[PDB]
Structure formats: structure tokens, C-alpha cells
Amino acid sequence: SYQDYINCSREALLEKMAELLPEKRLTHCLGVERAAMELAQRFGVDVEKASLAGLLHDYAKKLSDQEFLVLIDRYQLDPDLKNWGNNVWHGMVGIYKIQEDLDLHDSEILRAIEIHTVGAGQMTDLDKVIYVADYIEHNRAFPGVDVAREIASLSLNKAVAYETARTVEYLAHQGFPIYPQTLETYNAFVHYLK
Amino acid sequence: SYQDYINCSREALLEKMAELLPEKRLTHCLGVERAAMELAQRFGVDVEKASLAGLLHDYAKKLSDQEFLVLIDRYQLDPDLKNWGNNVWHGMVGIYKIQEDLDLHDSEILRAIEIHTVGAGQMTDLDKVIYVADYIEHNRAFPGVDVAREIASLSLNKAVAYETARTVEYLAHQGFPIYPQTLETYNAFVHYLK
Numbered sequence A, B: 001s002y003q004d005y006i007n008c009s010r011e012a013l014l015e016k017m018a019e020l021l022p023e024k025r026l027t028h029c030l031g032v033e034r035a036a037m038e039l040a041q042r043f044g045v046d047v048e049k050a051s052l053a054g055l056l057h058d059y060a061k062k063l064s065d066q067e068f069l070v071l072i073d074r075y076q077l078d079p080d081l082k083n084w085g086n087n088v089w090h091g092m093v094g095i096y097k098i099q100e101d102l103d104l105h106d107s108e109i110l111r112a113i114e115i116h117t118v119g120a121g122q123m124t125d126l127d128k129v130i131y132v133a134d135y136i137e138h139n140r141a142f143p144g145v146d147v148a149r150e151i152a153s154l155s156l157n158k159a160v161a162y163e164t165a166r167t168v169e170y171l172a173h174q175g176f177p178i179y180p181q182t183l184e185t186y187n188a189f190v191h192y193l194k
């Protein structure tokens, strides 16, 4: 059960999250919970760890810049983090808010949440399931989601590659800064597109 | 004169380069020589250093992988370079072939050639002139070259930003690895698009 990892039931957590998140964002988390479970079954990841990490991944999406900055200092995180924003923070720093609020201590779950946005050069299968589930969950409808879905039905590694390529391409198209760890992910996985 | 920097006249160099490069690539170098001179006048860079670096930037474009690998060892370059190819090598490693063949010792010229493909987080005005001249030289006709040209008429820094964004966007679109120093350039310059 979820109480095996956190300080409340799934139902209690959902009530908590309905307070913290707009309806669309909660619906997203619910979709990721479901998609993570499906991927975990396909690729031999603990379905329960996957479901829970999937539900929790965007827990900290609505924290303010001020809160994240507090957390960086208190937890003595990489100082460079101040140069970034929500996109990087909600996973990389947001895991600390999760730990505080829910007493989550499992390192594998914490890590999968931590890098859900940016990835890493080395990712566990659980990290990959969450990274991909976020992108393919049933509520998403962005052009090309169908391709991501088909890829993910066959290969976790190629799904990570496709999503990361698309993200880098779009950030450059938009003229947004690219977190260097995103590029570590890109370069590690891009060969899977071949 | 060019003999102020290298071991032969401009005419002798052109004869040398006609041996080393296909006609299209030599025509490109000639275009970059011209474009570098124009940019240097606009942005207060030594026109002679700019012209010479512009002409020489793609000198080593046709070396074989084997030659570059020799040069990496002999000059004891970053070992990671072996993981890459021509695109990175022809500037980053190719500067050594230039030094050997032509007795080029000027550090500013050598540096502008070195990073003409990948840029750096910190670039001298000369580095920027070469980086941009390569992209806007009159023989180029890629869609959007007109925009690059207009930008470069106003701002060296914004031209670096636009070119780097386009390069990162296209590499991700194609599913090609991105040299980490390219991202250093991207993140340093991307703010200029605003």
C-alpha cells in the first residue's frame, strides 16, 4: 500500500493534493500514476513504486520561487540552482518538500521524482518509467504524442530518447535556456533513435 | 599582409587550399574571408585578423578521421575528443594542422578558428565575427539566412545567439549528439534573443 512509503493513505494523499494543485494538474498526476503502472508491468519495474512516484512527480509544481530558494539553502543544494526556475526546481528541489510533507524516504522513488523533468546520463528503469509516463499519460494530446506512445509500447530507452530530443528541439526553437543535465540525458540516449 | 602571420602569401595560400579542398568549400572560405572583413569593420575587430581567420577557418575540413586522431594524441588534447568526429574536429583539432602547415602562432586567430563550429561561453569579438561570418557568407542560401544577415547587421551577440539556437534546434531535430561546449555557448548567448 502507499502507507508503506508515506505517512498517509492514497485517499488522504489525493485530498492533500487537491488542495495543492489545480484540477488539470491533479488529473495529470492521476494519468501519470496510471501510465507508470502500465509501463512498469511492461518493463519489469515495481508497479507500486512506479504508481506512487507517478502520482507524486508534480506534487511540488505550484510552490513559489521563494519556497524553492528556501529549500536550496536549507538542504544546501548545488548553488547553481538559483539561476534556474520552476521547471528545474519542481523535481530537483521539490523532492525535499515531498519528504517534509509525506515522510517519503525511499531513495529509488525520490530519485525518479528528482530527475523526472531533466533526466540523467544514467537512469534506473524506474526513473525511465516516470520520465516517459509523464509524457504519454492519457490526458496529453500534444501533436506527436501518438508516436511517443507507440515507441513506449516497444522500448523504454527509445521513448526516453524521443522525448529528450523533442524537449531539446523545442527549448532551442523557443530560445529558452537548457539545463545542462538535460543535455547529459540527450547525449546518453540519442543513439536509441537509430 | 597575410605573411605577417603565416609562412606564405595570400596567393600561395589559395593555391595550397585549392589542393586541399573541393571547389565549393574553397568558395565558402573565400566568402567567409569577405564576410569576416565586413563584420570586423562594423564591430571594431582587426579586419586583417578577421579576414585571415575567415579564410582559414575550414582549412582542415577534408582531413581524415585518422589524421585528427593522430593530432589528438601528439598534441595530448582532451581524450574525450575521440568520441566525436569531423564537425567538432576540423576547428578544435584542425588548428594544429594549420599551425604545422602555415606556421600560424597568433593566439587570437588560432582561438577564433578553434571554436568556429561550437563557440564558447566566453567569446572574444574576433571569435564572434568568425562564428557568424561562417553562417552568413554570401554563398549560403539556407532558409532563414536572410534573418541571420539582418541580425548580424545590428548585433554580433544576437547573431551568435540566433545561429547557436538554430544549430541546437536542428541537431535535436535530426537526432545528432550535441557537443557539450555548444550548449555552454547556447546558454551564455540565448538571452540576446530577448
Ligand SMILES: O=c1ccn([C@@H]2O[C@H](COP(=O)(O)OP(=O)(O)O)[C@@H](O)[C@H]2O)c(=O)[nH]1
Binding pocket: A028, A058, A061, A087, A088, A116, A117, A118, A134, A167, A171, A177, A178, A179, A180, A182
Ligand atoms: O532543461 C530543461 C528546461 C526546461 N524544461 C521544461 O520544463 C517543463 C516541465 O517539464 P516536466 O517534464 O516536468 O512536465 P510537467 O511538469 O509540465 O508535466 C517543460 O515545459 C519543459 O520544456 C525541460 O524539460 N528541460
Ligand SMILES: O=c1ccn([C@@H]2O[C@H](COP(=O)(O)OP(=O)(O)O)[C@@H](O)[C@H]2O)c(=O)[nH]1
Binding pocket: B028, B058, B061, B087, B088, B116, B117, B118, B134, B167, B171, B177, B178, B179, B180, B182
Ligand atoms: O555540437 C555540434 C555538433 C555538430 N555540429 C555540426 O557541425 C557542422 C559544421 O559546422 P561549421 O559551423 O563548422 O560549418 P561548415 O564547416 O559546414 O561551414 C554542422 O553541420 C553542424 O550542425 C555543430 O555545429 N555543433
Ligand SMILES: [Fe+3]
Binding pocket: A057, A058, A090, A091, A116, A117
Ligand atoms: Fe514535472
Ligand SMILES: [Fe+3]
Binding pocket: A028, A032, A057, A058, A134
Ligand atoms: Fe508532469
Ligand SMILES: [Fe+3]
Binding pocket: B057, B058, B090, B091, B116, B117
Ligand atoms: Fe567549419
Ligand SMILES: [Fe+3]
Binding pocket: B028, B032, B057, B058, B134
Ligand atoms: Fe565554414
